[PDB]
Amino acid sequence: TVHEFAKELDATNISIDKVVGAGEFGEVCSGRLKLPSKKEISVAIKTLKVGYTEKQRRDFLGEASIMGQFDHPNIIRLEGVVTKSKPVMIVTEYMENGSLDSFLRKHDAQFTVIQLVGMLRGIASGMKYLSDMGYVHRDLAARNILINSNLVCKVSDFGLSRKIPIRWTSPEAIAYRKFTSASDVWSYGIVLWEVMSYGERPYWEMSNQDVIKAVDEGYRLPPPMDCPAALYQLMLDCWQKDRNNRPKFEQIVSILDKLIRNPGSLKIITSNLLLD
Numbered sequence: 001t002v003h004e005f006a007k008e009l010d011a012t013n014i015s016i017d018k019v020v021g022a023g024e025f026g027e028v029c030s031g032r033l034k035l036p037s038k039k040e041i042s043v044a045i046k047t048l049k050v051g052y053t054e055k056q057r058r059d060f061l062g063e064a065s066i067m068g069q070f071d072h073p074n075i076i077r078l079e080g081v082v083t084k085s086k087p088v089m090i091v092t093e094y095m096e097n098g099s100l101d102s103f104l105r106k107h108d109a110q111f112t113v114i115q116l117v118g119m120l121r122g123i124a125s126g127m128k129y130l131s132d133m134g135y136v137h138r139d140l141a142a143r144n145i146l147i148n149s150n151l152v153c154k155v156s157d158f159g160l161s162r163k164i165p166i167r168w169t170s171p172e173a174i175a176y177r178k179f180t181s182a183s184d185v186w187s188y189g190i191v192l193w194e195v196m197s198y199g200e201r202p203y204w205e206m207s208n209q210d211v212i213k214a215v216d217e218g219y220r221l222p223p224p225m226d227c228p229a230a231l232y233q234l235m236l237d238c239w240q241k242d243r244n245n246r247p248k249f250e251q252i253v254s255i256l257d258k259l260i261r262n263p264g265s266l267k268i269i270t271s272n273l274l275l276d
């Protein structure tokens with residue numbers, strides 16, 4: 001049933017080169033995969049730890065069942081699964097520069113605005129496809145965006161793979177679990193702020209109850225330093241209280257494409273939370 005959405009890979013074609021992360025029930029590694037065409041590519045490899053239960057196997061492979069449904073340049077690519085041998089494995093494309101928030105923090109103010117908008121456009125395009133497919137992410141955050149050696153950004157849910165993430169969640173989803181593509185659009189607004197602020201934490205370390213209350217009262221994150229007015233306005237639109245008034249992802253992609261094609265528009269800039 002995982003094989004409905006995931007190719008079975010022969011473990012003979014996989015080399016594990018490094019353990020990258022580990023937990024109580026599994027590990028994340030990097031390595032190489034030899035494709036049926038004999039081409040070899042870099043991959044990430046999730047393995048279950050030796051001695052796992054059948055239910056752990058089922059839950060583990062459930063992740064690949066979901067991932068394999070999405071084939072898009074800006075969504076993490078599932079290469080396949082290993083189920084016929086042990087340990088069971090999930091194999092994905094390798095994203096050399098890791099999570100976007102931590103990457104941008106290492107490079108504060110070192111990219112052009114156009115480069116940043118390129119990243120954001122990729123993220124929007126992956127989300128447009130996810131929402132087209134009827135899938136609500138619910139965990140969209142810069143930490144769950146993976147960025148490769150060419151700065152291409154891909155939607156993942158590394159977080160879940162590794163409670164409501166309050167800082168990234170729309171008011172109605174916090175209030176009563178109303179998760180829709182419009183709540184993902186709210187989350188995308190926060191990612192937009194994270195990118196333009198080079199990986200600053202949304203709402204910093206405010207008490208969660210105050211994040212909920214402030215946003216409910218109408219307060220919003222302030223424009224990042226030197227933020228293009230167009231991009232801050234886009235944040236505010238993603239953060240409309242009325243979920244029906246938020247832009248669709250297709251509109252977001254369109255807006256970002258227009259800005260990329262006409263960079264001059266990004267020279268108009270804005271000038272703890274803001275009400276007005």
Ligand SMILES: Cc1ccc(-n2nc(C(C)(C)C)cc2NC(=O)Nc2ccc(OCCN3CCOCC3)c3ccccc23)cc1
Binds near residue numbers: 028062098
């Ligand atoms: C239960 C569950 C169900 C579904 C998901 N889920 N849903 C999605 C969609 C919807 C966005 C397509 C994506 C995911 N899961 C993931 O995005 N999973 C992963 C993220 C990062 C990884 O590698 C990170 C290591 N890599 C090293 C190099 O630097 C970058 C990070 C992974 C390595 C091996 C296997 C899975 C990985 C998650 C959990």
